[PDB]
Amino acid sequence: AHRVAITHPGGSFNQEVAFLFPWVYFFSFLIFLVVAGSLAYVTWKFRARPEDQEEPPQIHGNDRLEVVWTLIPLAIVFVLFGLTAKALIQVNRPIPGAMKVEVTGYQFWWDFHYPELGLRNSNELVLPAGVPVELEITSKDVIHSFWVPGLAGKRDAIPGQTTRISFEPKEPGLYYGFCAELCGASHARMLFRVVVLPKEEFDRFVEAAKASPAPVADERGQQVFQQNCAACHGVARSMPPAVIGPELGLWGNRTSLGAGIVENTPENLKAWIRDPAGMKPGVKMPGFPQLSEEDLDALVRYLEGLKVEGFDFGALPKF
Amino acid sequence: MVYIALFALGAALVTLFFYLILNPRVLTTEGETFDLRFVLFMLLLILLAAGTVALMLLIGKAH
């Protein structure tokens, strides 16, 4: 089970904002004690015995008290605000020399491009621990929002512009990611993973990715892929001239399928290929029910062969 | 900080001019000319409100 929490100190963002929570808890505790306590007292103390017909003392207020219970809350918000501004300024500060990663949202999946590396992957974003990253985010259709709670707050993906968020992953693991802007029928199925590896291991994955082409583990499979899939899917692990579907060149390294909604396994892959819509309402990929069982199996072998060796992302701690 | 204070000032002026023209005492004013007065305040209120909001939208793009 994934231990998803906005308080998890997996990234520099969650570590940097953490100091706000105790202040919130403290003031809220005091405010509750006083105000809720007073109201509790009132209901116990001033209940009226049914026989009582004598009206209580008709007091109209307390001018001094009005001032105190205006200024004290005011002071509290000034403190909260002061802490808030300090924290906001720090987490929005750009980090010089951070590896840029271009994030692009589609209905209903996520595309990733590492411009300095010349590398493309989809739905699972691999990152080095201890290294600052700058996410450059946009959309090709409607508004989306890129959210990895275990690492950092979200930033919207808005068509026609580029938004950004910077942070430094610290703790290696497999992080759940969600789209956090209602984008259509499969909003709840527009997920992803952030794979955080030790820097040394990250440098290896990227090197192997760009070192040689994606293997061909089944030739009958490569042809079936060419006749049915290549039209929408690249396997070259780099930006195609026109993007239609996700990159499949690193498919065999993917822990999840369908933009992170189900485990990547041969059985899940078959079901997906036969009827994507059955898993993602409104999904923009046709099913392939005609394909012979022989072709589908051959196709799955080929797909699962599109990878680099020596990595096991499914063994990372789950966040 | 200067622009935020300018925004606050805008809102205060919008508030003030609404008060000056719409409080119960001023609305009892008689004369065919009050209609013109009332409407010219609205003209000014449009400018004040639009400018105040426009200011903040532009601040939104001033990274």
Binding site: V24, D52 | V39
Partner: protein, 780 residues
């Protein structure tokens, strides 16, 4: 049938109030059922009960129905229409036919929204917020949702203007604003805030509709439009709306506290100042809904600041409510229970609200169940509890029957317990990173299944509460003990009437001395004996079919707009029928006999109603112009070479300014008894307006042939704002024409000329707005 014809034609504020109230609470029950479908789907991971588009449809209907058809109605248009005139010691509202029209338009809006079910694409599925460009692209019933919002806007604005005119003009002689019940102040504050701010939603709604129907866009990045500008417009109203939803309920809480504590209101002046404070700040915080959209840090910090300030005026209000209870002799009747539930829960609701204002934290909390918990905390356990405090408080007054206290209390505890169990787990879910608006979730995320199951159990407990609530009302109406004039021992004027009140409200003449905001208290001490009213001075507004007919034909106009490509023949057919209806309405006497019209201010109700409605016009043009100024100054919108010529706008300025002078002098003559000169000036004004319109039309035709609003942002802005102004010329022109038809039938006299005062003032406004338009669209 007899009861139907009565309701279709009534102008009695009490019946209108009951209709609003019953409709609003029906809306709550309908949307509550929707919430049960939602929570059933969410009870376990990977559920297949309600999925995808269907879930998003139910979700959208749940939220919009609760916000637009329930919470912002019950405590405002419902209780308010019934109770406010009584509290003011009046016999009706300022504009009884307008008031009825506002109810029927409300019902019309509800029908528009729900009927989407029967059309291709069904109900809207884009969330109540209908974010662009998602809402521009959807096949779902977005058009019906947008039409509904626009139709509803007419109901709200007219209703708000009616409330404020009623408060200014109909207060019992001797009662200054500062002697009114706190609830009236809160209805006052809510109405003013609503009048000014609705503009944001009107703009956002109109612009998405125009885009879907005729391809005119302010938001499309391909022409330099700004998708985020849509959110700026939307939230410019959609924050203020929640304070419009809060103020009346705080007013109710204070009223209930005073009555059931046998104490006067603690810090009455401070309570008013706090509501004023909330109205002002309420319009300066909208962008805290937009923290994650990539606006500058300075912009974000600005909104975090003003948002946190809101906590101060609100606290002061709550503290004063608690002060009202303090030292009292608490009668533990049902309404007081709701009040206590409100206050205890609102503390957490407001606190989490402030947590959300802390921008860094909001980066996490945004679009997660933490937000969902926050707003149900303040809308359900807050306003909602307020609504039920109000329902039980005024139930005897509205129905003439007492309810069973035992059932009332059972309803309360079920809602309390159910509320906690439903929504406390949702705060936790937010901490656990659960996004909102997800029809389903996986099973390999720790905590989610357990917390979601608990939440669903809570929701079913609220369901039970709902059954208990319905039974309670049913039992009360069928076998309940008949209600006395003043069952709780209240001190405000609504308790000086019968239960329910006679048609004319007060059988007695009221004293003209109000030492405080508790007249029943002060008069009883002075032994003031109240004398019966002379039935000769009692005149009730006549029933009329035209408000309903007008709402019906406008409803049909909006159906033709929603369901078909624009424009179409049906739009025109129903607009024509609608115009006909308004002509009959304008020629129909308010009363059967002659009547002495005296108001507190000296200004007619027509004048006063128009002056407050015009506030909404200022708002609408202000927000649209702000958007335009922003797009142009940022370099996005630049005029094409073929822009309409300046000389043509100056000619038009001459026409329009002249028309303001002909109409002014036309009114002047009416004030002198010279009727032919008056008829003539009015007619001249009308002809001048027509000329302005014909000139604009030709200019629009020409400009349309030289520049596409699909390819040029400035052109889109021009047609939008100058076009909208053109529509105003038509409306104002028609208004003047109504007055002229009145003059031709001898309905205009030195005595009665309200329609003329309103139309004239609205015309001057059209003139003023033109001057701003010339400035920013033809000069600049």
């Amino acid at each position: 049938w007899a009861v139907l014809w009565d309701l279709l034609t009534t102008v009695d504020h009490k019946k209108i109030g009951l209709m609003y109230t019953a409709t609003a609470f029906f809306a709550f029950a309908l949307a509550g059922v929707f919430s049960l479908l939602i929570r059933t789907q969410l009870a376990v991971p990977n559920n297949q009960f309600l999925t995808g588009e269907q879930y998003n449809q139910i979700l959208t209907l749940h939220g919009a129905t609760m916000l637009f058809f329930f919470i912002i109605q019950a405590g405002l248009t419902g209780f308010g229409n019934f109770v406010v005139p009584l509290m003011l010691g009046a016999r009706d509202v300022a504009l009884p036919r307008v008031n009825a029209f506002s109810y029927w338009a409300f019902l019309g809006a509800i029908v528009l929204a729900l009927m989407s079910y029967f059309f291709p694409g069904g109900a809207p599925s884009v969330g109540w917020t209908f974010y662009y460009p998602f809402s521009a692209q959807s096949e779902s019933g977005v058009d019906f949702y947008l039409a509904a919002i626009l139709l509803l806007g007419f109901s709200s604005l007219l209703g708000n203007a009616n409330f404020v005119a009623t408060i200014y003009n109909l207060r019992a002689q001797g009662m200054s604003l500062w002697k009114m019940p706190i609830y009236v102040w809160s209805v006052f504050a809510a109405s003013v805030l609503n009048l000014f701010s609705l503009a944001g939603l009107t703009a956002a709604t109109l612009l998405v509709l125009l885009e879907r129907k005729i391809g005119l866009s302010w938001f499309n990045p391909a022409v330099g439009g700004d998708p985020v500008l849509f959110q700026q417009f939307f939230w410019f109203y959609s924050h203020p709306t929640v304070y419009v939803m809060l103020l009346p309920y705080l007013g109710i809480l204070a009223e209930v506290a005073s009555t059931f504590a046998r104490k006067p209101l603690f810090g009455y002046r401070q309570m008013v100042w706090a509501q004023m404070g909330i109205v002002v700040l309420g319009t300066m915080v909208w962008a805290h809904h937009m923290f994650t959209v990539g606006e500058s840090t300075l912009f974000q910090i600005a909104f975090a600041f003003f948002t946190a300030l809101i906590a101060v005026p609100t606290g002061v209000k709550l503290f004063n409510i608690i002060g009202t209870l303090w030292g009292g002799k608490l009668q533990m009747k049902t309404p007081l229970y709701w009040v206590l539930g409100f206050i205890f829960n609102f503390l957490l609701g407001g606190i989490t609200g402030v947590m959300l204002s802390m921008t860094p934290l909001d980066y996490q909390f945004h679009d997660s169940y933490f937000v969902v918990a926050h707003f149900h905390n303040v809308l359900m356990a807050g306003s909602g509890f307020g609504a039920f405090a109000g329902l039980y408080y005024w139930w005897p007054k509205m129905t003439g029957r007492m309810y069973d206290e035992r059932l009332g209390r059972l309803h309360f505890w079920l809602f309390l317990v159910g509320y906690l169990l439903t929504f406390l787990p949702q705060y936790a879910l937010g901490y656990l990173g659960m996004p909102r608006r997800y029809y389903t979730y996986n099973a390999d995320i720790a905590g989610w299944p357990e917390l979601n199951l608990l939440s669903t159990i809570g929701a079913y407990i609220l369901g039970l509460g709902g059954l208990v609530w319905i039974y309670t009302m049913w039992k009360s109406l069928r076998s309940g003990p008949k209600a006395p004039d003043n069952p709780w021992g209240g001190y405000t004027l609504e308790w000086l009437t019968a239960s329910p009140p006679k048609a004319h409200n007060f059988d007695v003449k009221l004293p003209t001395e109000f030492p405080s905001e508790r007249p029943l208290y002060d008069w009883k001490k002075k032994g003031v004996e109240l004398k019966p009213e002379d039935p000769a001075h009692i005149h009730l507004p006549n029933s009329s079919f035209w408000p309903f007919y007008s709402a019906a034909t406008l409803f049909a106009f909006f159906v033709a707009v929603a369901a078909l490509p624009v424009p179409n023949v049906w739009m025109w057919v129903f607009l024509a029928l609608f115009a006909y209806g308004l002509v009959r309405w304008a020629l129909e006497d308010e009363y059967s006999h002659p009547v002495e019209h005296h108001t507190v201010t000296g200004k007619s109700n027509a004048w006063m109603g128009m002056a407050w409605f015009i506030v909404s016009e200022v708002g609408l043009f202000a927000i649209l112009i702000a958007g335009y100024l922003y797009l142009r100054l940022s370099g996005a919108a630049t005029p094409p070479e073929e822009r309409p010529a300046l000389w043509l706008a100056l000619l038009n300025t001459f026409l329009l300014v002249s028309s303001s002078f002909t109409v002014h002098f036309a009114h002047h003559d009416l004030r002198r008894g010279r009727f032919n000169p008056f008829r003539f000036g009015l007619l001249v004004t009308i002809i001048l307006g027509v000329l302005f319109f014909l000139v604009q039309s030709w200019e629009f035709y020409q400009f349309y042939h030289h520049s596409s609003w699909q390819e040029n942002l400035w052109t889109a802005a021009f047609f939008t704002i100058v076009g909208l102004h053109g529509l105003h010329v038509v409306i104002g022109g028609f208004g003047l024409i109504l007055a002229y038809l009145q003059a031709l039938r001898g309905k205009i006299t030195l005595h009665n000329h309200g329609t003329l005062e309103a139309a004239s003032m609205y015309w001057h406004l059209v003139d003023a707005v033109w001057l701003v338009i010339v400035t920013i669209f033809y000069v600049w």
